[PDB]
């Protein structure tokens, strides 16, 4: 059977018994930087099993009225294990990611989720012509919630779900690497995202490489059961991570 997959990174393993295939970015597997593309001169560090491992972020609740959530990386993992320490102590970084989302329910539940990774997911503020701080869009590993109605508070991003906070049709997100979690036949989605950027390396505290979004296209529904909510959990594992430019640790 091809419906069972096992993934092993470092000292952690992920086993799924009802999973779809695995999506690999744009057909490109993560790899280390080549000699003829590098620009920095000093030797890069390559913590391997220490940084490359699965790290489970906090879990969320899925209710009948949920609208969606998003996470920004690597700011989500900025304070997770030795990966956060390496980010803090280094000026440059580079790594691919493997994203796994878990969501299980009985055969009597119905619903559908869209899992997509959006590189360079620039977002606009609620009030056009008014800036927002670096807290309405990333504050660690906590999830940020979309809104059904138009956002009105000026200190946060426009959370209109149908526009996805990017001024584009929410239904056209299929272009990016993505997967669906249909409760009929699937419980989890796996995406392998290589390093995508315009430069060989970049600072992981100043730049958000990509954004992860989970949007329920078909709202959850059930009847006559003792389960009131369906938890969702997200797991991420850096791959082929390397750093450069050691310095004092960013506060």
């Amino acid at each position: 059977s091809d419906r069972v997959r096992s993934i092993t990174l470092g000292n952690s393993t992920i086993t799924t018994q009802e999973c779809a295939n695995v999506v690999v970015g744009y057909g490109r597997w993560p790899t280390y930087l080549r000699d003829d593309e590098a620009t920095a001169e000093d030797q890069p560090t390559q913590p391997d099993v220490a940084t490359c491992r699965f790290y489970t972020l906090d879990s969320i609740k899925w209710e009948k009225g949920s609208v969606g959530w998003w996470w920004k990386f690597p700011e989500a993992l900025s304070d997770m294990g030795l990966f956060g320490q390496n980010m803090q102590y280094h000026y440059l970084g580079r790594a691919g990611y493997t994203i796994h989302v878990q969501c299980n329910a009985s055969k009597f539940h119905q619903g559908c989720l869209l899992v997509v990774c959006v590189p360079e997911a620039e977002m606009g503020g609620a009030v056009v012509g008014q800036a927002f701080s670096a807290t309405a869009m990333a504050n660690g590993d906590k999830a940020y919630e979309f809104t059904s109605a138009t956002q009105s508070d000026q200190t946060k991003v426009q959370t209109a779900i149908h526009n996805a906070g990017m001024g584009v049709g929410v239904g056209n997100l299929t272009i990016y690497p993505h997967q669906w979690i249909n409760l009929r036949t699937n419980n989890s989605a796996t995406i392998v995202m290589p390093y995508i950027n315009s430069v060989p390396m970049d600072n992981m505290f100043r730049h958000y490489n990509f954004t992860l979004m989970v949007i329920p296209f078909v709202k959850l529904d059930y009847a006559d059961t003792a389960s009131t909510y369906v938890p969702i959990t997200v797991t991420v594992a850096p791959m082929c991570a390397e750093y450069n430019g050691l310095r004092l640790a960013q506060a």
Binding site: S1, D2, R3, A20, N21, V22, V23, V24, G25, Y26, G27, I175, P177, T185, V192
Partner: protein
């Protein structure tokens, strides 16, 4: 140092043109709009395991 290549035409109807470069910078050349290679697999089949159309998608 003159390049001779075919020019666009129809299915069943000297279809040659000559080009010469006058400047020392490649940025001054004309558009190279004669390339027609494409591959949609990167966006249509991003899966890891190859799936055959005839066989069931799952199991």
């Amino acid at each position: 140092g003159a390049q001779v290549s075919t020019q666009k035409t129809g299915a069943h109807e000297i279809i040659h043109y000559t080009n010469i470069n006058y400047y020392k910078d490649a940025a001054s050349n004309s558009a190279n709009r004669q390339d027609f290679t494409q591959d949609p697999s990167k966006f249509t089949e991003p899966v890891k395991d190859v799936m055959i159309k005839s066989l069931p998608a799952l199991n």
